[PDB]
Amino acid sequence: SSVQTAATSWGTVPSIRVYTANNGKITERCWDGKGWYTGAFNEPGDNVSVTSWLVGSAIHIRVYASTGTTTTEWCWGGNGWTKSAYTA
Amino acid sequence: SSVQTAATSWGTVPSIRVYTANNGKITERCWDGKGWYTGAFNEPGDNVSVTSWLVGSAIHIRVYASTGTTTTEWCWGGNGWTKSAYTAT
Amino acid sequence: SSVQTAATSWGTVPSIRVYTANNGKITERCWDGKGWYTGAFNEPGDNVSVTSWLVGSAIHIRVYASTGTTTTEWCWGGNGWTKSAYTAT
Numbered sequence A: 001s002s003v004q005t006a007a008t009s010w011g012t013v014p015s016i017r018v019y020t021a022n023n024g025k026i027t028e029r030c031w032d033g034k035g036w037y038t039g040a041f042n043e044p045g046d047n048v049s050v051t052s053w054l055v056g057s058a059i060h061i062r063v064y065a066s067t068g069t070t071t072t073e074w075c076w077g078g079n080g081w082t083k084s085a086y087t088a
Numbered sequence B, C: 001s002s003v004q005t006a007a008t009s010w011g012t013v014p015s016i017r018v019y020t021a022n023n024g025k026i027t028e029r030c031w032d033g034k035g036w037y038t039g040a041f042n043e044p045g046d047n048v049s050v051t052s053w054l055v056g057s058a059i060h061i062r063v064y065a066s067t068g069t070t071t072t073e074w075c076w077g078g079n080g081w082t083k084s085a086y087t088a089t
Ligand SMILES: C[C@@H]1O[C@@H](O[C@H]2[C@H](O[C@@H]3[C@@H](O)[C@H](O)CO[C@@H]3O)O[C@H](CO)[C@H](O)[C@@H]2O)[C@@H](O)[C@H](O)[C@@H]1O
Pocket: A017, A028, A030, A032, A038, A039, A040, A041, A059, A061, A076, A078
């Protein structure tokens, strides 16, 4: 068995976010040009994927966290992480 | 066990496509700014990844669907999904 | 069981790189507009993800290769692949 990761990046610095599903929990490591740090994202899941887009200089991120057949969408728009009503 | 997903997005609306491998079948959920809907993509696979690029406002998508060691490339270019001749190795 | 892939792309040609974890080894298939070929990337891993960004016309790629709880970051910036000091948590 191994952990399962997902990655996204933006700009040219770059900024990078790496998500890791490990024993039913997803955590986040972050690079903004000056070291890797532990990010605010921490939610349940056995599987993770991610996508992101910029609106001007502001990053928007969607993290799809799945356990069993249930997928939860987590949303970042600059002010914290919230789960949406997204339902597979 | 759990399902396995892959996601891609484009533009600033944005549009998002989320692919889910579940019991050997990959399906697709779609967002173009006005609700989530079930997409046209439905193909066999135990594993899925995706990438996409824009040419102007036209989206192009490649979905890599795997079973065993066999990886099949599915292509969207505005007018349906088609399997390419892509092979692993 | 099945292989596990990750994909990235850039520009409008486009270029595409597909990474596959297969029996503890990750390999790479490449498209630059003129056929699929086996890429330089070949490293151990049971799981792979990837991201890339352009700086002008130069592609930069990070591949995250995991075995157990150990994740290795492999870096391409035009001159070959090297591992960084990236350590999970
Ligand atoms: C996208 C977001 O990134 C981190 O959020 C932290 C936020 O970090 C960033 C900032 O340092 C960077 O240079 C550019 O933008 C980002 O938003 O910074 C604030 C403090 O200003 C907090 O530390 C945020 O946690 C992650 O922690 C988030 O989970 C998310 O990935």
